[PDB]
Nucleic acid binder design. Structure first.
Length: 75
DNA sequence: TAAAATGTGATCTAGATCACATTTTAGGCAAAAAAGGCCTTGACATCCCACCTCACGTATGCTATAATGTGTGCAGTCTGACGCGGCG
Protein backbone atom coordinates (compact mmCIF):
# COMPACT_ATOMS: atom_id res chain seq x y z
CA UNK A 1 0.00 0.00 0.00
CA UNK A 2 1.08 3.66 -0.20
CA UNK A 3 0.99 3.74 3.63
CA UNK A 4 3.27 0.70 4.10
CA UNK A 5 6.31 2.70 3.00
CA UNK A 6 6.15 5.72 5.36
CA UNK A 7 8.45 6.46 8.29
CA UNK A 8 6.59 6.42 11.58
CA UNK A 9 7.13 10.14 12.34
CA UNK A 10 4.14 10.89 10.08
CA UNK A 11 2.14 9.38 12.96
CA UNK A 12 3.75 11.98 15.25
CA UNK A 13 5.15 9.48 17.77
CA UNK A 14 6.39 10.20 21.33
CA UNK A 15 9.97 10.34 22.58
CA UNK A 16 9.86 7.24 24.82
CA UNK A 17 8.13 5.15 22.14
CA UNK A 18 10.56 6.54 19.55
CA UNK A 19 13.49 5.37 21.68
CA UNK A 20 11.76 2.00 21.92
CA UNK A 21 11.49 1.81 18.11
CA UNK A 22 15.03 2.93 17.22
CA UNK A 23 16.32 0.66 19.99
CA UNK A 24 14.82 -2.44 18.33
CA UNK A 25 15.95 -1.99 14.69
CA UNK A 26 12.40 -1.34 13.44
CA UNK A 27 12.83 0.80 10.29
CA UNK A 28 9.77 0.63 8.01
CA UNK A 29 6.09 0.56 8.87
CA UNK A 30 6.17 -2.65 6.86
CA UNK A 31 8.74 -3.68 9.46
CA UNK A 32 6.42 -2.46 12.24
CA UNK A 33 3.36 -4.46 11.25
CA UNK A 34 5.42 -7.64 10.75
CA UNK A 35 6.41 -7.43 14.44
CA UNK A 36 4.10 -9.00 17.03
CA UNK A 37 2.78 -7.52 20.28
CA UNK A 38 4.59 -9.87 22.68
CA UNK A 39 7.74 -9.15 20.67
CA UNK A 40 7.19 -5.55 21.87
CA UNK A 41 6.03 -6.05 25.48
CA UNK A 42 9.15 -7.96 26.53
CA UNK A 43 11.34 -5.18 25.12
CA UNK A 44 12.78 -2.27 27.14
CA UNK A 45 10.43 0.54 28.22
CA UNK A 46 7.38 -0.92 26.41
CA UNK A 47 4.98 -1.96 29.17
CA UNK A 48 1.37 -0.90 29.47
CA UNK A 49 0.76 2.36 27.73
CA UNK A 50 2.96 2.50 24.61
CA UNK A 51 0.90 -0.43 23.29
CA UNK A 52 -2.28 1.43 24.31
CA UNK A 53 -1.79 4.65 22.35
CA UNK A 54 0.10 3.09 19.43
CA UNK A 55 -2.97 0.86 19.15
CA UNK A 56 -4.99 4.09 19.19
CA UNK A 57 -3.12 5.81 16.35
CA UNK A 58 -3.01 2.69 14.16
CA UNK A 59 -6.75 2.40 14.79
CA UNK A 60 -6.86 6.01 13.53
CA UNK A 61 -4.99 5.68 10.22
CA UNK A 62 -6.45 2.38 9.07
CA UNK A 63 -3.92 -0.37 9.87
CA UNK A 64 -3.25 -2.85 12.67
CA UNK A 65 -0.49 -4.85 14.38
CA UNK A 66 1.11 -8.22 13.83
CA UNK A 67 0.11 -8.50 10.17
CA UNK A 68 1.98 -10.64 7.64
CA UNK A 69 3.96 -9.52 4.58
CA UNK A 70 5.29 -11.20 1.46
CA UNK A 71 7.85 -9.95 -1.06
CA UNK A 72 9.38 -7.77 1.67
CA UNK A 73 11.56 -5.59 1.33
CA UNK A 74 11.15 -4.21 -2.21
CA UNK A 75 13.32 -1.34 -0.90
C1' DT B 1 -48.99 -54.59 0.75
C1' DA B 2 -44.22 -52.21 0.19
C1' DA B 3 -41.18 -50.42 3.06
C1' DA B 4 -39.76 -48.47 7.23
C1' DA B 5 -40.07 -49.24 12.56
C1' DT B 6 -39.49 -52.39 16.67
C1' DG B 7 -37.85 -55.98 20.26
C1' DT B 8 -32.96 -59.81 22.56
C1' DG B 9 -30.24 -58.47 26.61
C1' DA B 10 -25.66 -59.42 28.03
C1' DT B 11 -21.32 -57.02 27.47
C1' DC B 12 -18.88 -53.55 27.68
C1' DT B 13 -16.44 -47.88 27.95
C1' DA B 14 -15.04 -42.54 28.38
C1' DG B 15 -15.86 -39.47 32.42
C1' DA B 16 -17.35 -38.35 37.26
C1' DT B 17 -16.34 -39.02 42.43
C1' DC B 18 -14.35 -37.30 46.21
C1' DA B 19 -11.34 -35.12 50.57
C1' DC B 20 -7.28 -32.62 51.05
C1' DA B 21 -2.25 -30.70 50.27
C1' DT B 22 0.29 -27.44 47.59
C1' DT B 23 0.90 -23.48 43.74
C1' DT B 24 0.24 -19.33 42.17
C1' DT B 25 -0.92 -15.71 41.22
C1' DA B 26 -3.00 -12.57 40.82
C1' DG B 27 -4.38 -7.93 41.15
C1' DG B 28 -3.39 -4.63 43.06
C1' DC B 29 -0.93 -2.09 46.48
C1' DA B 30 3.86 0.13 47.87
C1' DA B 31 7.75 1.59 45.09
C1' DA B 32 12.69 1.66 42.89
C1' DA B 33 14.51 3.40 39.48
C1' DA B 34 14.65 5.15 34.48
C1' DA B 35 13.16 7.92 31.09
C1' DG B 36 10.71 11.84 29.79
C1' DG B 37 9.73 16.78 31.40
C1' DC B 38 12.16 20.68 33.84
C1' DC B 39 16.40 23.21 34.04
C1' DT B 40 21.68 23.84 33.58
C1' DT B 41 26.51 23.53 31.61
C1' DG B 42 30.26 23.42 28.11
C1' DA B 43 31.37 23.80 23.75
C1' DC B 44 30.79 25.24 19.01
C1' DA B 45 29.15 27.82 14.85
C1' DT B 46 27.61 31.44 12.92
C1' DC B 47 26.77 34.99 12.61
C1' DC B 48 24.85 40.55 13.17
C1' DC B 49 26.86 44.70 13.76
C1' DA B 50 29.30 47.84 12.68
C1' DC B 51 33.45 49.75 12.25
C1' DC B 52 36.49 50.77 9.51
C1' DT B 53 38.86 51.57 4.42
C1' DC B 54 41.33 52.23 0.38
C1' DA B 55 40.38 53.04 -5.04
C1' DC B 56 37.92 54.77 -7.95
C1' DG B 57 34.92 58.26 -8.93
C1' DT B 58 33.51 62.81 -8.97
C1' DA B 59 32.99 68.25 -8.28
C1' DT B 60 35.55 71.98 -9.72
C1' DG B 61 39.38 75.42 -12.37
C1' DC B 62 41.78 77.38 -16.56
C1' DT B 63 43.21 77.33 -21.77
C1' DA B 64 45.80 84.85 -23.71
C1' DT B 65 46.96 85.08 -32.46
C1' DA B 66 42.26 85.82 -33.39
C1' DA B 67 37.31 85.29 -34.24
C1' DT B 68 31.48 89.66 -32.48
C1' DG B 69 22.62 90.60 -35.24
C1' DT B 70 18.94 84.42 -35.78
C1' DG B 71 16.74 82.89 -39.51
C1' DT B 72 17.01 77.52 -41.60
C1' DG B 73 13.76 74.16 -42.79
C1' DC B 74 9.02 73.47 -41.46
C1' DA B 75 3.34 74.80 -42.34
C1' DG B 76 0.13 73.93 -45.75
C1' DT B 77 -3.50 77.36 -46.10
C1' DC B 78 -10.38 72.70 -43.28
C1' DT B 79 -14.59 75.61 -41.95
C1' DG B 80 -18.71 77.70 -40.17
C1' DA B 81 -20.16 80.38 -35.95
C1' DC B 82 -19.37 83.28 -32.34
C1' DG B 83 -16.76 87.10 -29.42
C1' DC B 84 -14.32 90.85 -29.25
C1' DG B 85 -11.27 94.88 -30.68
C1' DG B 86 -10.63 97.83 -33.92
C1' DC B 87 -12.46 100.40 -37.69
C1' DG B 88 -15.34 104.03 -39.87
Amino acid sequence: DPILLRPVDDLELTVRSANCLKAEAIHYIGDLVQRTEVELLKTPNLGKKSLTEIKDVLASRGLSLGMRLENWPPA
